[PDB]
């Protein structure tokens, strides 16, 4: 098994909807423990954790220099996508139309 990435993540480019209707976040890893398992979570409008919304199976960083695509299935309305662990976690707001 991989160890959970202990480092920080940043956005490589704008978060966007995919051809199949999911939401893709492409991240650039800033740590030094790759290959490592990406911590991921989703939150509702109130910042409360909601499970089962990660589409990508077992997202990993294999090389710190290579960005990683991560897809989520957010709920309609306001929510957050969170990449990484701790307070340093990359927290992205998302609004899903209709």
């Amino acid at each position, epitope marked *: 098994s991989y160890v959970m990435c202990t480092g920080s993540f940043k956005l490589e480019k704008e978060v966007a909807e995919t051809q*199949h209707g999911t939401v893709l976040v492409q991240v650039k890893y800033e740590g030094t423990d790759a290959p490592c398992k990406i911590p991921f979570s989703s939150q509702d409008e109130k910042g409360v954790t909601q499970n089962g919304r990660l589409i990508t199976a077992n997202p990993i960083v294999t090389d710190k220099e290579k960005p990683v695509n991560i897809e989520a299935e957010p709920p309609f309305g306001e929510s957050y996508i969170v990449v990484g662990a701790g307070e340093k976690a990359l927290k992205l707001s998302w609004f899903k139309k209709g």
Partner: antibody, heavy 117, light 108 residues
């Protein structure tokens, strides 16, 4: 009559690059995604990546990240794919196709790339 | 990445029979599976979308079924124009991946 026209073939020297086109007609170009695929005899079809003409959103299969570049010319309803530093492993039929929530529906005629000196 | 397995590279049939072509996903892809028909020197033609929906113009001989990992393209009353290559595609997540194909041939 939705159509996607690609040139029939391209002969490329080993180490050179190639740029191929996909011209769409019969539908609103900016309302649908474009997919690019690689088909070689003996090997399963591969998805290279996709691009959304209205926004410029682009996604790649990591297997083709160093090889392919997907661009657009929305004023002429055309999608482009550029392949860099070609080897014999790059000889294949390259298809473009219209996409969306229901996946590829209409496929182009394919561009046959031959890598040879 | 998701792997789409078509265990049968070739299948033999007779005109008027039923043939079932299988496609197995390596993970749960729900119903995000399309089926395509391809003849030599021609571009693929879309047959089924979202596992079980028939594209406009496609004969009712063609039906798709399954959800999760096990998908099947069923061709009832096989016609000689149905002799072709058939392949599946998952579009549940990137990268999209295709089955290796199954070629339908005539028994003699």
């Amino acid at each position: 009559d939705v159509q996607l026209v690609e040139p029939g073939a391209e002969l490329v020297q080993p180490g050179a690059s190639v740029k191929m086109s996909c011209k769409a007609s019969g539908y609103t170009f900016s309302s649908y995604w474009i997919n690019w695929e690689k088909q070689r005899p003996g090997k399963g079809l591969e998805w290279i990546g996709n691009i959304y003409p209205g926004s410029g959103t682009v996604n790649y299969d990591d297997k083709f990240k160093s090889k392919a570049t997907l661009t657009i010319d929305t004023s002429s309803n055309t999608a482009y794919m550029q392949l860099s530093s070609l080897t014999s492993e790059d000889s294949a039929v390259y298809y473009c196709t219209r996409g969306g929530s229901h996946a590829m529906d209409y496929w182009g005629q394919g561009t046959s790339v031959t890598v040879s000196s | 990445d998701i792997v789409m397995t078509q265990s049968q590279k070739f299948m033999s049939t007779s005109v008027g029979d039923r043939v079932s072509i299988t496609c197995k996903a390596s993970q749960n892809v729900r119903t995000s599976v399309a089926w395509y028909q391809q003849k030599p020197g021609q571009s693929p033609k879309a047959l089924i979308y979202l596992a079980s929906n028939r594209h406009t113009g496609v004969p009712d001989r063609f039906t798709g079924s399954g959800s999760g990992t096990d998908f099947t393209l069923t061709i009832s009353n096989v016609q000689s124009e149905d002799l072709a290559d058939y392949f599946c595609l998952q579009h549940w997540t990137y990268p999209y991946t295709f089955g290796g194909g199954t070629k339908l041939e005539i028994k003699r």
